[PDB]
């Protein structure tokens, strides 16, 4: 535990100091005595103690950026899926062993204390977690980078499983306070809504608006042992200063803007409140950007001093807002303001699913943001004039490329707005960025090919290796030193150890340790027992049809049915774990969760099966749980329909943590297999080309049903009520979608998936060879560090050079 | 400044320590550098530094009460009008001179920093401020006393004067945080609403309720230099743990319970939200009381270990709630539970005005608190049985004494509930307590004479002398030492100085210093100029008809009209200041404010008048402003209709601070005059007896109009639009009320008031004799220390002996 060298030194004076400050905070901050103090009090005493170590560096870092005046990177996102902060802070400041020793001497278990901290669950999934990894990597790469978002009072809902169904409860993450953030009410800014436009003597004026205040809360973002501490600024909605009682209560309405994260993953819902949130972040953020620009030494130098990165189209209003500020308030001519805006802004796309893309009704924008709609129209007219000049007489292209979508309800295509108003547009994996240029944004790619880039996603090896899997980090460091922690390509050195008996032993030893620990977590927290001598088969990710948890379900039932047909036949024991949240209004996703639990109700209680197969639904999947389960996983399920998962990042986490991957050639799965060698991945199923071929002739699920007796058996089990005897018709909607309305072709990959899974079991029967393939995976996961990703953003889009150079 | 000895020592190590901790907090707490730090940052750095000095004593005091196990005093109030905390803390801990020196050395003016702090304005007026003085005195008297209330997000509205009218804005006192309180989310308790009653096997059960959580916030309450730090616990409403988005937003509804203070002074409005607030405090508080009782060493010893003081009928639900807990949850028989309840509870009455008394509709109580209504009915039946036994056949007495008020809407009389359920009932001045026994509660007094007590109000000489008027505190200490600060009767020693030339000089010198300072405040904050060589004539208190700001208006116009009639005639120059808030729905009070400003619009701009007379409306009258204006006052206006002001406390503040009093024989005015000698007070107008005589024959305002030419002139000025030329009929409602519907007989005291005011001017023309009478006032203000009041509560009601003995 304390013997782990990647965890740093327990200096005698440092341990002394930590204990003193722990005790100081318990007394003065918590107002507690050792007689009444709870484990929670002790967590907070430690949190404040550790947080104190960020402050000096935090002040100096921001002073450094003022003095050096580097180009500043503003990462705008509606989501920051941060997770917990205590361990991350200790890791990045080299304090983990010292705090572990200090708390031990005080008679406390630091890991028990760590479990007390609430996740900052201010994200839905991959997009939100990407923002979080990016913040970490940008600090580690010494960039003057500023995360900007919303401080949701309630993050992603806490998931309860009750009667086998998902129940949602408010994620009250701030109940006991947040010891990391610093409230900055003095830097509160006004954000305007509604009102109307007056075009007058100077030009346009936005008047008669309703004001909502944006109160910033700043959170330190430590780089890895480089003395850099950057800032995440999250805005909180506040009623403006100035019958009676009802008027005071009605302050809640404005303040609702920052109340709760919209729980949609890869799905657009056009709620006005969501639009208000989106503008809230954009307006307040751009005020900071402009003010800071002005206090740095005329708007010709703006894109040399400012980069605005748009995480999806969610902060896309930054484009017309910047135009609004520059033209209406700063009084620049349109053309120069637009030159500045495009050079300043860049856009990252995260999906190709049409229903996941933002298309706001013009009426909503006209009412809420009349000046912005006017600016959008003008952007559109001039952009389409450029299209018309480049492609004379191509009228359909004009229609296709327009920011304005015609129809029953006229809408603004926010992605189109982003491409027009950005100098760079990127997808998040090679295949995805290619598909953007080929299909979705083909016309835009043809107009401006230089604009379109790829930035394959990454994950931080701090949180996602050193923090969550110190045992693996240690055995790696024992061989290759510690440099890999911020230079992950050095993991390639581990290929020299594929035949090393000691390393093979240790890789397997670490995995087993993680599996025992996760089993212990489930027993402690849920009284759920899992077979420690079973393959841990894990699919953790948001519940979506495209991600095909349903395909996993079909395979699980296949294993069950095969056991029942031939009970004497040996099979590799498995614990099949599926976890993830369904969006509250996503009926099918909610049914899918109930199916998983219902499958378990049969399988986990069939005495013929016993511990040979178990299916469990991991409740409340979130960042902190990912940190627990991923290091314990043997098999990583990455089985999206080819062409649907833009990148994935959970895949990267599994690869880095010693699981083998079963997956389709989709998103970053392709590059992962490329890095490791396809021989080291369990690749199966339709390629994008094959999916398109099925689309061309029409997908007929009935054909697969008719030709595959084992599939037929399962569908009939589902329909007849084998998995819901008390309500036979419970899964009729799932069965109907699969048979008649499956956009994601579950049946088409069933046979290949089942066969590929057989090969997984075949390799698992050979522990030595399983582990050797694992080594080949970990050793080639280096590309998927978010440091690599960020360095690319920095050099190819932002025009800044990253540096891992330590601050004094 | 720093030469003031009552402000303590500036120890060299102490000054060093304070500066170090100031700097430590600026760095680690505020995350600020001297380059970006504002005066507000510096205030907070000081506040945290000073607050740290409370902690050791706070922990030790509460440990002391656990060890000693004294009887605990629970002071239940819907209001705690605390004001600011920084200076009070420094005063009570003897740190003022040290902090003044420390900040000076840091290049800061501590008094500028003090002005940054928001008032904890969690009260309306006298009743709320009494609770605050009581907390201070109970700590100074070493009582194990616990203030319990609601942490309003918004206290008493901030008053703006715009176009001469009151405008209300939300009092966002927590905008920049509160460095004094300690949030205690770990001690959160459930409070129940609505639901229904099941009478079953064990008995009654309150079921199907809606839960609102009560989160306690604890604030230190330091005694005067005795090392005692008690606790004020204020509950905050929190939604319970467990479509989607709307459900999360609807958490606001439960949380609205603690959102805002109902801005009514001496007026009952029967809003359900107010009832919810009242029960919210009671339910959460009594849970603490019961739990603490159980952890002290069977409910026979409860009243020996618990006292519950009810500040007005606002927490009266404590009576049926205690019964509910003891009978329904603790399973005691009714009779024993009732014995306990009465012995535990005591009730303080603050008014005789019928519209100020709480009478809740039975339907509201039945819906919101069905079990409580049931218990109230049973309390009533048994109480009336006792009445019937004591007064056989007296049926009207039964009707009069019933807790249930019959009529169109059937109501519960909360005062009747309180008397029935309390072993002690007290009024707040001798005349008031007598009037209670004579009229309002006559029947109850006849049934249980022993129950009825007097506790004449008091004010704390810490906040109200040492803090607000250090100059006066010092010249007093120079003669008689410092013991008087917690033994105010020692001020009687000052009678030996009525002929002392040095003291006469210094008393006058201090007053002038305060007047210059207040003039400077008005110039700095409002660019309002006042004549420093004018008598400061001050009426500060909530705007009410009974308090008769209108009588003040009539006199002001009389002075104006007399000047205009005889411009050559010398008059003592006056600055007439009136300040105070009107309840938002109190139309007449709002008109009265507009009249004051409208009078000023004429008087302050008449060139014949010049600086001989000025009328100003003091905006946003609150605790911190009282601390500024009261020490600057020459004349204290205490002119309520005899029999209407229960006590007053503002009167006491003025007496202690060297103003002479013009007042009616009402409330504590009577005892003030008794203490000082009537010759030293400007007493005028109807006595209670005279008011009653007018009521018997009918008050005819027309008679006074017909007989007093000067009054007639003023009424005609008001009616014709002399004070509102742009809207002649503006004051028709005021004129109509005065002439036809005046419950408070303004005209009946006009002549005596004007004559008495002439005598004020006559004495003011003689500075020596003015000051000598002032000395006779300050010297006899000792009775009106809240220490005296609290000692009486302790000995006569709570059954505890006060002690000024220092903790180690
Ligand atoms: O780009 C970050 C992530 O965004 C979204 O969650 C996509 O669905 C996922 O494929 C991608 O990895
Ligand atoms: O008892 C405290 C105070 O309560 C109310 O404000 C009364 O109106 C006042 O007369 C009294 O002094």
Short mmCIF file of N, CA, C and O in Angstrom, two decimals, chain A residues 305-383:
data_model
loop_
_atom_site.label_atom_id
_atom_site.label_comp_id
_atom_site.label_asym_id
_atom_site.label_seq_id
_atom_site.Cartn_x
_atom_site.Cartn_y
_atom_site.Cartn_z
N UNK A 305 -4.54 35.74 -29.22
CA UNK A 305 -4.55 35.70 -27.77
C UNK A 305 -5.69 34.85 -27.20
O UNK A 305 -5.70 34.54 -26.00
N UNK A 306 -6.63 34.46 -28.06
CA UNK A 306 -7.80 33.70 -27.64
C UNK A 306 -8.10 32.51 -28.56
O UNK A 306 -8.14 32.64 -29.79
N UNK A 307 -8.29 31.35 -27.95
CA UNK A 307 -8.88 30.20 -28.63
C UNK A 307 -10.15 29.78 -27.89
O UNK A 307 -10.14 29.62 -26.67
N UNK A 308 -11.25 29.63 -28.63
CA UNK A 308 -12.49 29.10 -28.07
C UNK A 308 -12.79 27.73 -28.67
O UNK A 308 -13.07 27.62 -29.87
N UNK A 309 -12.71 26.69 -27.84
CA UNK A 309 -13.05 25.35 -28.29
C UNK A 309 -14.47 24.99 -27.88
O UNK A 309 -14.83 25.10 -26.71
N UNK A 310 -15.26 24.59 -28.86
CA UNK A 310 -16.66 24.25 -28.64
C UNK A 310 -16.79 22.73 -28.54
O UNK A 310 -16.62 22.01 -29.53
N UNK A 311 -17.07 22.26 -27.32
CA UNK A 311 -17.33 20.84 -27.08
C UNK A 311 -18.76 20.52 -27.53
O UNK A 311 -19.72 20.79 -26.81
N UNK A 312 -18.87 19.95 -28.73
CA UNK A 312 -20.17 19.76 -29.41
C UNK A 312 -20.76 21.13 -29.76
O UNK A 312 -20.10 22.16 -29.61
N UNK A 313 -22.00 21.14 -30.25
CA UNK A 313 -22.67 22.39 -30.62
C UNK A 313 -23.32 23.07 -29.43
O UNK A 313 -23.95 24.12 -29.58
N UNK A 314 -23.18 22.46 -28.26
CA UNK A 314 -23.84 22.97 -27.05
C UNK A 314 -23.49 24.43 -26.71
O UNK A 314 -24.38 25.20 -26.36
N UNK A 315 -22.20 24.81 -26.82
CA UNK A 315 -21.90 26.23 -26.69
C UNK A 315 -21.79 26.98 -28.03
O UNK A 315 -21.13 28.02 -28.08
N UNK A 316 -22.43 26.48 -29.08
CA UNK A 316 -22.33 27.08 -30.42
C UNK A 316 -22.74 28.55 -30.48
O UNK A 316 -22.27 29.29 -31.34
N UNK A 317 -23.62 28.96 -29.57
CA UNK A 317 -24.04 30.36 -29.48
C UNK A 317 -22.88 31.33 -29.23
O UNK A 317 -23.06 32.54 -29.34
N UNK A 318 -21.70 30.80 -28.91
CA UNK A 318 -20.49 31.62 -28.77
C UNK A 318 -20.16 32.36 -30.06
O UNK A 318 -19.64 33.47 -30.03
N UNK A 319 -20.47 31.72 -31.19
CA UNK A 319 -20.23 32.31 -32.50
C UNK A 319 -21.06 33.59 -32.72
O UNK A 319 -20.47 34.66 -32.89
N UNK A 320 -22.41 33.51 -32.69
CA UNK A 320 -23.18 34.75 -32.78
C UNK A 320 -23.01 35.71 -31.59
O UNK A 320 -23.12 36.92 -31.77
N UNK A 321 -22.74 35.18 -30.40
CA UNK A 321 -22.48 36.04 -29.23
C UNK A 321 -21.20 36.86 -29.41
O UNK A 321 -21.19 38.06 -29.12
N UNK A 322 -20.12 36.23 -29.87
CA UNK A 322 -18.88 36.96 -30.15
C UNK A 322 -19.11 38.04 -31.21
O UNK A 322 -18.68 39.17 -31.04
N UNK A 323 -19.79 37.67 -32.30
CA UNK A 323 -20.21 38.64 -33.31
C UNK A 323 -21.02 39.79 -32.71
O UNK A 323 -20.76 40.96 -33.02
N UNK A 324 -21.99 39.46 -31.86
CA UNK A 324 -22.83 40.46 -31.20
C UNK A 324 -22.01 41.44 -30.37
O UNK A 324 -22.18 42.65 -30.47
N UNK A 325 -21.11 40.90 -29.55
CA UNK A 325 -20.22 41.73 -28.73
C UNK A 325 -19.33 42.62 -29.61
O UNK A 325 -19.28 43.84 -29.40
N UNK A 326 -18.66 42.03 -30.59
CA UNK A 326 -17.72 42.79 -31.43
C UNK A 326 -18.40 43.87 -32.28
O UNK A 326 -17.88 44.98 -32.40
N UNK A 327 -19.55 43.54 -32.85
CA UNK A 327 -20.27 44.48 -33.71
C UNK A 327 -21.10 45.49 -32.90
O UNK A 327 -20.95 46.70 -33.08
N UNK A 328 -21.96 45.00 -32.01
CA UNK A 328 -22.90 45.85 -31.27
C UNK A 328 -22.26 46.65 -30.14
O UNK A 328 -22.63 47.81 -29.91
N UNK A 329 -21.32 46.03 -29.43
CA UNK A 329 -20.74 46.65 -28.23
C UNK A 329 -19.37 47.26 -28.50
O UNK A 329 -19.08 48.36 -28.02
N UNK A 330 -18.53 46.55 -29.25
CA UNK A 330 -17.19 47.04 -29.58
C UNK A 330 -17.16 47.86 -30.88
O UNK A 330 -16.15 48.51 -31.18
N UNK A 331 -18.25 47.81 -31.64
CA UNK A 331 -18.45 48.66 -32.83
C UNK A 331 -17.48 48.37 -33.99
O UNK A 331 -17.13 49.27 -34.76
N UNK A 332 -17.06 47.11 -34.11
CA UNK A 332 -16.28 46.69 -35.27
C UNK A 332 -17.21 46.47 -36.46
O UNK A 332 -18.39 46.18 -36.28
N UNK A 333 -16.68 46.62 -37.67
CA UNK A 333 -17.46 46.33 -38.87
C UNK A 333 -17.67 44.82 -38.95
O UNK A 333 -16.85 44.05 -38.44
N UNK A 334 -18.77 44.41 -39.57
CA UNK A 334 -19.14 42.99 -39.65
C UNK A 334 -17.99 42.11 -40.14
O UNK A 334 -17.66 41.11 -39.49
N UNK A 335 -17.40 42.49 -41.27
CA UNK A 335 -16.36 41.69 -41.93
C UNK A 335 -15.15 41.40 -41.06
O UNK A 335 -14.64 40.28 -41.06
N UNK A 336 -14.67 42.42 -40.34
CA UNK A 336 -13.52 42.24 -39.46
C UNK A 336 -13.89 41.38 -38.25
O UNK A 336 -13.13 40.50 -37.86
N UNK A 337 -15.07 41.64 -37.69
CA UNK A 337 -15.58 40.86 -36.56
C UNK A 337 -15.72 39.38 -36.90
O UNK A 337 -15.42 38.52 -36.08
N UNK A 338 -16.16 39.09 -38.13
CA UNK A 338 -16.31 37.72 -38.61
C UNK A 338 -14.97 37.03 -38.85
O UNK A 338 -14.82 35.84 -38.58
N UNK A 339 -14.00 37.79 -39.36
CA UNK A 339 -12.63 37.30 -39.52
C UNK A 339 -12.09 36.85 -38.16
O UNK A 339 -11.55 35.75 -38.03
N UNK A 340 -12.28 37.70 -37.16
CA UNK A 340 -11.87 37.43 -35.78
C UNK A 340 -12.56 36.19 -35.21
O UNK A 340 -11.90 35.30 -34.66
N UNK A 341 -13.88 36.13 -35.37
CA UNK A 341 -14.71 35.05 -34.83
C UNK A 341 -14.29 33.67 -35.35
O UNK A 341 -14.12 32.74 -34.56
N UNK A 342 -14.15 33.55 -36.67
CA UNK A 342 -13.78 32.27 -37.29
C UNK A 342 -12.39 31.83 -36.84
O UNK A 342 -12.19 30.68 -36.45
N UNK A 343 -11.44 32.77 -36.85
CA UNK A 343 -10.08 32.50 -36.39
C UNK A 343 -10.01 32.14 -34.90
O UNK A 343 -9.10 31.45 -34.47
N UNK A 344 -10.99 32.60 -34.13
CA UNK A 344 -11.05 32.33 -32.69
C UNK A 344 -11.68 30.97 -32.38
O UNK A 344 -11.22 30.24 -31.49
N UNK A 345 -12.73 30.62 -33.12
CA UNK A 345 -13.56 29.47 -32.76
C UNK A 345 -13.21 28.18 -33.51
O UNK A 345 -12.83 28.21 -34.68
N UNK A 346 -13.34 27.06 -32.81
CA UNK A 346 -13.20 25.74 -33.41
C UNK A 346 -14.23 24.80 -32.79
O UNK A 346 -14.62 24.97 -31.64
N UNK A 347 -14.65 23.81 -33.57
CA UNK A 347 -15.79 22.98 -33.20
C UNK A 347 -15.44 21.50 -33.23
O UNK A 347 -14.82 21.02 -34.18
N UNK A 348 -15.81 20.80 -32.16
CA UNK A 348 -15.61 19.36 -32.06
C UNK A 348 -16.96 18.63 -32.13
O UNK A 348 -17.85 18.89 -31.32
N UNK A 349 -17.07 17.72 -33.09
CA UNK A 349 -18.26 16.90 -33.29
C UNK A 349 -18.07 15.53 -32.64
O UNK A 349 -16.99 14.94 -32.73
N UNK A 350 -19.13 15.03 -32.01
CA UNK A 350 -19.09 13.79 -31.22
C UNK A 350 -20.07 12.69 -31.66
O UNK A 350 -20.16 11.65 -31.00
N UNK A 351 -20.80 12.91 -32.75
CA UNK A 351 -21.76 11.89 -33.24
C UNK A 351 -22.28 12.14 -34.65
O UNK A 351 -22.23 13.26 -35.15
N UNK A 352 -22.80 11.08 -35.27
CA UNK A 352 -23.41 11.18 -36.60
C UNK A 352 -24.91 10.87 -36.56
O UNK A 352 -25.60 11.03 -37.57
N UNK A 353 -25.40 10.44 -35.41
CA UNK A 353 -26.82 10.13 -35.27
C UNK A 353 -27.64 11.42 -35.36
O UNK A 353 -27.41 12.36 -34.59
N UNK A 354 -28.58 11.48 -36.33
CA UNK A 354 -29.33 12.71 -36.61
C UNK A 354 -30.08 13.25 -35.39
O UNK A 354 -30.13 14.46 -35.19
N UNK A 355 -30.63 12.36 -34.57
CA UNK A 355 -31.42 12.76 -33.40
C UNK A 355 -30.56 13.30 -32.25
O UNK A 355 -31.08 13.85 -31.29
N UNK A 356 -29.24 13.15 -32.38
CA UNK A 356 -28.31 13.65 -31.37
C UNK A 356 -27.82 15.06 -31.70
O UNK A 356 -27.13 15.69 -30.89
N UNK A 357 -28.18 15.55 -32.88
CA UNK A 357 -27.74 16.86 -33.35
C UNK A 357 -28.75 17.95 -33.01
O UNK A 357 -29.96 17.72 -33.06
N UNK A 358 -28.25 19.13 -32.66
CA UNK A 358 -29.08 20.25 -32.21
C UNK A 358 -29.66 21.06 -33.35
O UNK A 358 -28.94 21.62 -34.18
N UNK A 359 -30.99 21.14 -33.38
CA UNK A 359 -31.71 21.91 -34.37
C UNK A 359 -32.79 22.71 -33.64
O UNK A 359 -33.86 22.19 -33.33
N UNK A 360 -32.49 23.98 -33.35
CA UNK A 360 -33.38 24.81 -32.53
C UNK A 360 -34.43 25.52 -33.39
O UNK A 360 -34.09 26.13 -34.40
N UNK A 361 -35.72 25.44 -32.98
CA UNK A 361 -36.78 26.16 -33.70
C UNK A 361 -36.50 27.66 -33.74
O UNK A 361 -36.13 28.25 -32.72
N UNK A 362 -36.68 28.28 -34.91
CA UNK A 362 -36.41 29.71 -35.07
C UNK A 362 -37.25 30.58 -34.14
O UNK A 362 -36.78 31.61 -33.67
N UNK A 363 -38.49 30.14 -33.87
CA UNK A 363 -39.41 30.88 -33.00
C UNK A 363 -38.88 30.99 -31.57
O UNK A 363 -39.00 32.04 -30.93
N UNK A 364 -38.27 29.90 -31.09
CA UNK A 364 -37.68 29.86 -29.76
C UNK A 364 -36.51 30.83 -29.66
O UNK A 364 -36.41 31.59 -28.69
N UNK A 365 -35.65 30.81 -30.68
CA UNK A 365 -34.51 31.71 -30.75
C UNK A 365 -34.93 33.16 -30.92
O UNK A 365 -34.34 34.06 -30.33
N UNK A 366 -35.97 33.39 -31.73
CA UNK A 366 -36.49 34.74 -31.92
C UNK A 366 -37.02 35.36 -30.63
O UNK A 366 -36.81 36.55 -30.38
N UNK A 367 -37.69 34.55 -29.82
CA UNK A 367 -38.25 35.01 -28.55
C UNK A 367 -37.15 35.21 -27.50
O UNK A 367 -37.03 36.29 -26.91
N UNK A 368 -36.33 34.18 -27.30
CA UNK A 368 -35.30 34.18 -26.26
C UNK A 368 -34.08 35.04 -26.60
O UNK A 368 -33.56 35.75 -25.73
N UNK A 369 -33.62 34.97 -27.84
CA UNK A 369 -32.40 35.65 -28.25
C UNK A 369 -32.57 36.34 -29.60
O UNK A 369 -31.93 35.94 -30.58
N UNK A 370 -33.43 37.38 -29.67
CA UNK A 370 -33.76 38.01 -30.95
C UNK A 370 -32.55 38.55 -31.72
O UNK A 370 -32.50 38.44 -32.95
N UNK A 371 -31.58 39.13 -31.01
CA UNK A 371 -30.39 39.67 -31.66
C UNK A 371 -29.52 38.55 -32.24
O UNK A 371 -28.93 38.71 -33.31
N UNK A 372 -29.48 37.42 -31.54
CA UNK A 372 -28.70 36.28 -32.01
C UNK A 372 -29.29 35.66 -33.27
O UNK A 372 -28.56 35.30 -34.19
N UNK A 373 -30.62 35.57 -33.33
CA UNK A 373 -31.29 35.09 -34.54
C UNK A 373 -30.97 35.98 -35.74
O UNK A 373 -30.70 35.47 -36.84
N UNK A 374 -30.99 37.29 -35.53
CA UNK A 374 -30.68 38.26 -36.58
C UNK A 374 -29.26 38.06 -37.11
O UNK A 374 -29.03 38.09 -38.32
N UNK A 375 -28.33 37.85 -36.19
CA UNK A 375 -26.93 37.63 -36.52
C UNK A 375 -26.76 36.28 -37.25
O UNK A 375 -26.00 36.20 -38.21
N UNK A 376 -27.48 35.26 -36.79
CA UNK A 376 -27.47 33.94 -37.44
C UNK A 376 -27.92 34.04 -38.90
O UNK A 376 -27.26 33.49 -39.80
N UNK A 377 -29.03 34.73 -39.14
CA UNK A 377 -29.52 34.96 -40.50
C UNK A 377 -28.48 35.63 -41.39
O UNK A 377 -28.29 35.22 -42.54
N UNK A 378 -27.81 36.65 -40.87
CA UNK A 378 -26.79 37.38 -41.61
C UNK A 378 -25.55 36.51 -41.88
O UNK A 378 -24.97 36.56 -42.97
N UNK A 379 -25.16 35.72 -40.88
CA UNK A 379 -24.09 34.73 -41.05
C UNK A 379 -24.46 33.79 -42.19
O UNK A 379 -23.63 33.51 -43.06
N UNK A 380 -25.72 33.34 -42.19
CA UNK A 380 -26.20 32.39 -43.18
C UNK A 380 -26.21 32.95 -44.60
O UNK A 380 -25.79 32.28 -45.54
N UNK A 381 -26.69 34.19 -44.75
CA UNK A 381 -26.74 34.85 -46.05
C UNK A 381 -25.34 34.99 -46.66
O UNK A 381 -25.13 34.65 -47.82
N UNK A 382 -24.39 35.47 -45.86
CA UNK A 382 -23.02 35.65 -46.33
C UNK A 382 -22.31 34.32 -46.59
O UNK A 382 -21.56 34.20 -47.56
N UNK A 383 -22.56 33.33 -45.73
CA UNK A 383 -21.99 32.00 -45.93
C UNK A 383 -22.49 31.35 -47.22
O UNK A 383 -21.71 30.79 -47.98
#
